[PDB]
Design a protein around this ligand. Structure first.
Ligand SMILES: Nc1ncnc2c1ncn2[C@@H]1O[C@H](COP(=O)(O)OP(=O)(O)O)[C@@H](O)[C@H]1O
Ligand SMILES: Nc1ncnc2c1ncn2[C@@H]1O[C@H](COP(=O)(O)OP(=O)(O)O)[C@@H](O)[C@H]1O
Ligand SMILES: [Mg+2]
Ligand SMILES: [Mg+2]
Lengths: 469, 475
């Protein structure tokens, strides 16, 4: 529940003029800018690199859910969503009564001579993409750029800017209306589910109710996600589903975004605008794509491996693309799983062979999708579009448990055990592969103990001098 | 559809008097003033200059479609369109019925001595707007036609007056399609379905021209506009002569005014006969009779103020304006495109001023496909210009999207990413990654770069202290 008190902003567009709903909205520039700037990452100090394997594995398993890097498509989707929300409200001006009547009035005023100039001046969407591409998370982050509920004191309008409905696994069209009321309740503090969402009602009545409630709480955008989950058998076949969605758009009267997979596009082939959420491309315009390189370089810094390689090889990045094929779940999944297996086996360095072992063993269920993308054949890609890696969370727990069962110790882990203060161990890990640990650690401890006041930044050159003299 | 119930007006002309189709039309001064006076554009404040490059670039890419400066050829075309539409209705007055019978009756009156003065005579004007692609013909046509209501309903006569109909030819065009698309366009303006009923692939062009005539006179059509004549395939339509016949026949079978918009290469179809009237949408000329053209000066100065750059050149220089004309050669698409693309290049490069070198750089990198035509315009050779008159820069909107995406990437680059790209060697990046936590980026990257620039072949191990020494205190 996100409520805010409305502040009306002077726009530069005549259609938006004196429209409280658009004026209360954040500026289009902000929503476009915030799409580029609003990223989430992890707080990794060098101390976290020194910690135990269980602790570091727990931290690694959080990259899947606490790391977000914006890309080019995110800005495009943000502008599209903002244009939808503002455009959906251009017709709904409470004071601008009639659109056609103003045309006649202006034509009359021109014919009389009151006006010396006048201009006779004179929608849903479908986000289709493979699973793991990043549709749902991108939607969540883009919607965080807006206030979900904006209250206007000048009236009693409780504006609900955005509402997202996810679809149940093996779901039905019946459940979408009920979940609409549920989501509005959870995002507004109301209890429409108890009253309107009752089994006695039919879909038609619930559709009208959805329309009325969305017009009372003027709905900028309605998001229905994971429509791939909707069961064709229960929903009544591809056409029926299609018909429902079409009708649902006209009744509610708000812009509607449907998010699904290329297989769910088979439902809509009898007809909505379609924007595609394609996987990351390594070669763009006959040239290496810098977005892929930037994303992999940023993700590389979330690497809690002691014998790690700080610089990303072209080899490792390109095998990463080969296995992942640009779908962003399998990118992050491959990174995390490779780090876990490295923790398990020692050899805490990511190689192409380690990535290949992870791909061969832990990512078998999504292979038919990936190879389909490798083939470029649209039918195969559509067929395997819904494929995901089941029970990945339990598997991450299992691999972390395997790490915990390890009674062995790496040489670097031993050396960190011998040294005591974090700064000492930081100096070690910084220089541990350019010098032999056996002669490295004693000099570090001697220098640190003999200069308690001296800063670690000042102590590093001293240890360097002693090492080379 | 823009459907309006007629409100009649008193025009001062006797010939226009009590003619519903002209009286319901908006006044001539309004139509001429409306296109000229309306110069609506983006309003930019000093605050907007001091803003993020993403949002500034967003505003910059909106200049192409939100900037319109009315110019002389536009105003002449507006007046001519108004005169054409109004003039074409004088012989179509509903009151002046049984025109030939009146003639007979008038004759009879004269032949009885009742009438001492009568005149026997038997006004579908035609226009050919010839200009290079990118001059601004379509935008001017759209803005002129937006000052008019497309459909006016006459309650007394039960007649749906279609003021204007615009047909856009396809990239490989047949004179068939034009005919068909007529109906399609009408079916969009009215509620009709003439395409489903009358106009089908089965019927021939000659039959469909007669159907066009019948339906255009039922819904009295002030103006038929066929735009992008250049796109028509001369091998698919049967040759220049046949094509010409079509238009001539169309102007004579249909009693409505017709406007054809095309390139200098499409004039070759009509060059056999100077009929058709010709308006030439020449590019903006730098000099007028040996002295500067204030049209060029005004257009460039007005567009120059729509500049979201911090260290902007306070006012447009003669050097920069002369380079701007040299590259663009007066074609308004290239002017605005060069301006916008150069602003996006300045934002991407981090600079906040427009240089002549920047304009030349964008011209050479981005506007390659149109280079022949522009060069031809420098030569002044008519045939050479006509050959390349149809040239259009392709996919510039996707390139604007790519440019502002690249601008977005540099803005949101992490300080680590900026440093790793500024370091030229793997060793330097390894050193930066080692020392990033306890040392500041201001000295760290330059110190490493100069340390490797003065000891070119030297190991990382030996060069770590030298970088450290200069950071603590060193040469
Ligand atoms: N911008 C991003 N940066 C980093 N990781 C991402 C990003 N977008 C998505 N991911 C990863 O992809 C995973 C799956 O994304 P999800 O929203 O489920 O896509 P879809 O809905 O298409 O299956 C997320 O758990 C997240 O870890
Ligand atoms: N009067 C004008 N002021 C500003 N820009 C213009 C003007 N006329 C045309 N343009 C620019 O030229 C571009 C294309 O013009 P267009 O109408 O297609 O010319 P043509 O029909 O000759 O190709 C448009 O994107 C528009 O931005
Ligand atoms: Mg999904
Ligand atoms: Mg054109």
């Amino acid at each position: 529940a996100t409520r805010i008190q409305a502040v009306y902003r002077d726009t530069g567009v005549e259609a938006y003029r004196d429209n409280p709903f658009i004026e209360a909205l954040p500026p289009l520039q902000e929503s476009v800018n915030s799409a580029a700037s609003l990223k989430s990452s992890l707080q990794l100090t060098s101390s976290d690199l020194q910690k135990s394997r269980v602790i570091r594995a727990h931290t690694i398993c959080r990259i899947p859910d606490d790391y977000f890097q914006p890309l080019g498509t995110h800005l495009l989707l943000s502008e599209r969503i903002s244009v939808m929300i503002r455009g959906g409200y251009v017709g709904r001006n409470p004071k601008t009564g009639d659109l056609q009547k103003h045309l006649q009035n202006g034509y009359e005023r021109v014919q009389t001579g009151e006006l010396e100039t006048f201009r006779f001046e004179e929608q849903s969407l479908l986000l289709i993409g493979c699973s793991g591409s990043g549709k749902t998370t991108s939607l969540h982050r883009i919607l965080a750029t807006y206030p979900q509920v904006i209250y206007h004191r000048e009236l009693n309008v409780e504006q609900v800017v955005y509402l997202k409905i996810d679809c149940s696994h093996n779901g039905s069209l019946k459940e979408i209306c009920l979940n609409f009321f549920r989501a509005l309740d959870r995002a507004l503090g109301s209890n429409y589910e108890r009253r309107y969402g009752l089994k006695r009602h039919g879909i038609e009545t619930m559709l009208a109710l959805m329309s009325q409630i969305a017009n009372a709480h003027v709905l900028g955008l309605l998001v229905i996600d994971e429509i791939q989950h909707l069961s064709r058998s229960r929903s009544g076949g591809s056409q029926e589903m299609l018909n429902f969605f079409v009708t649902m758009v006209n009744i509610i009267g708000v812009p509607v975004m449907l998010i699904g997979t290329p297989k769910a596009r088979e439902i809509f082939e009898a007809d909505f605008g379609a924007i595609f959420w394609d996987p990351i491309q390594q070669t763009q315009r006959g040239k290496p794509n810098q977005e892929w390189i930037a994303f992999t370089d940023n993700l590389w810094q979330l690497q809690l491996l002691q014998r790690k390689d700080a610089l990303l090889s072209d080899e490792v990045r390109d095998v990463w693309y080969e296995l992942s094929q640009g779908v962003m779940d399998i990118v992050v999944k491959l990174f995390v799983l490779a780090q876990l297996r490295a923790l398990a086996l020692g050899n805490e360095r990511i190689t192409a062979g380690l990535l290949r072992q992870v791909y061969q063993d832990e990512l078998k269920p999504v292979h038919p999708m990936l190879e389909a993308l490798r083939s470029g054949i649209p039918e195969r890609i559509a067929r395997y579009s819904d494929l995901v890696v089941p029970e990945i969370d339990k598997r991450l727990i299992q691999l972390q448990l395997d790490i915990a069962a390890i009674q062995e110790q790496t040489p670097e882990e031993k050396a960190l055990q011998e040294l005591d203060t974090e700064d000492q161990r930081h100096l070690y890990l910084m220089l541990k592969e350019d010098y032999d640990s056996s002669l490295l650690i004693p000099t570090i401890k001697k220098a640190f103990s003999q200069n308690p006041t001296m800063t670690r930044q000042k102590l590093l050159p001293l240890v360097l001098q002693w090492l080379m003299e």
